[PDB]
Amino acid sequence: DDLGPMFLPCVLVPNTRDCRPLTYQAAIPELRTPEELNPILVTPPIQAIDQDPGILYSILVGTPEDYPRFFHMHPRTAELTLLEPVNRDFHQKFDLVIKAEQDNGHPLPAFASLHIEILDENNQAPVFDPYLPRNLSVVEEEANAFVGQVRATDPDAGINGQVHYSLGNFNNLFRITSNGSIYTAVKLNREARDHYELVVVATDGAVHPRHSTLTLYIKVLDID
């Protein structure tokens, strides 16, 4: 008797001869174009094979219901195409059911799920507080001495608005904490060097991060 297709990979549910059902995965940034994004990468790659003729792939049903305005699945290659840029204010995700059927003979179809996440655009870079003191004094011959503190904010929502601090230079002489506090990492020496132009970097938590930088002028003071 004819057997139908199965989606890959087929990992058997233990103490059965049944494949565990698959949920394929994709993620698409909102507002980007078809031309930029196509073909959409699916993980793992969509594939079905005859358990024993040809194979036809389709999207059977899905939600939200206007998915056919946004996606096309090639019937022979399973390649997934975006048709229009998605706006995350209208769609945060799509959940699709896909099917594979035998071309010659009874369809004996297999089914899988396909989840497509829509990623929020990271519209803005962090913005340092404009009235921060940037001329900073610190005494020599002191390690772990507090130098000063910066702050930046980011308008975007979620991870896209969460600010992280790092130094752009002199990473052997200073350090910065998650709240923007800068300390010496070693004992400085005025006689050796009395001035540093230190770069602080503010980065957001986005998949595609944005960054800003601030210059601080550090003066090393005599112990007296």
Q: Which does 160 bind (CB under 5 to 8 A by kind): Na ion, Ca ion, K ion, none?
A: Ca ion
Answer yes or no: are the C-beta atoms of 40 and 80 closer than 8 Å.
yes
Angstrom distance (rounded) from CA 74 to CA 35: 17
Nearer to Na ion, 64 or 107 (CB): 107
Least distance from K ion to the Cβ atom of residue 208, Å: 13
Smallest CA-to-CA distance from 131 within 148, 146, 150 is with 150
Residue 52: contacted member of Na ion, K ion, Ca ion, none (CB under 5 to 8 Å, by partner type): Na ion
Min. distance of Cβ 104 from Na ion in angstroms? Answer: 9
Distance CA 194, CA 173 (A): 13
The verdict on 52 binding Na ion (CB under 5 A) reads yes
CB 206 within 8 A of CB 156: yes
Task: Please answer whether residues 121 and 31 qualify as being in contact, where contact means their C-beta atoms are separated by less than 8 angstroms.
Answer: yes
- Provide the binding-site residues for K ion, judged by CB under 5 A: 88, 120-121
Check binding of 50 to Na ion (CB under 5 A): yes
Does position 204 interact with Ca ion (CB under 5 A)? The reply is yes
- The listed partner (K ion, Ca ion, Na ion, none) that binds 101, CB under 5 to 8 Å by sort, is none
Euclidean distance between CA atoms 38 and 82, whole angstroms: 6
204 binds, among Na ion, K ion, Ca ion, none (CB under 5 to 8 A by kind): Ca ion
In the complex, minimum distance from the CB of residue 126 to Ca ion, in angstroms, rounded to a whole number = 7
Closer to K ion by CB, 125 or 136: give it. Answer: 125
Q: Of the listed pieces 47-55, 137-145, 163-171, 209-217, which binds Na ion according to CB under 5 A?
A: 47-55
50 binds, among Ca ion, Na ion, K ion, none (CB under 5 to 8 A by kind): Na ion
Q: What is the CA radius of gyration of the chain?
A: 28
Q: Which of 39, 202, 200, 36 shows the shortest CA–CA distance to 121?
A: 36
Where in 122-151 is the site for Ca ion (CB under 5 A)? 122, 124
Geometric angle at alpha carbon 20, from 14 and 22, rounded to 5°: 160
Single residue of 101, 120, 140, 154 touching Ca ion by CB under 5 A: 154
Going by C-beta distance under 8 Å and a sequence separation of 6 or more, which residues neighbour residue 150? 128, 129, 132, 165, 176, 180, 182, 200, 202, 214, 216
6 binds Na ion (CB under 5 A): no
Q: Footprint of Ca ion on this chain (CB under 5 A)?
A: 122, 124, 154, 156, 160, 204
Q: Footprint of Na ion on this chain (CB under 5 A)?
A: 2-3, 50, 52
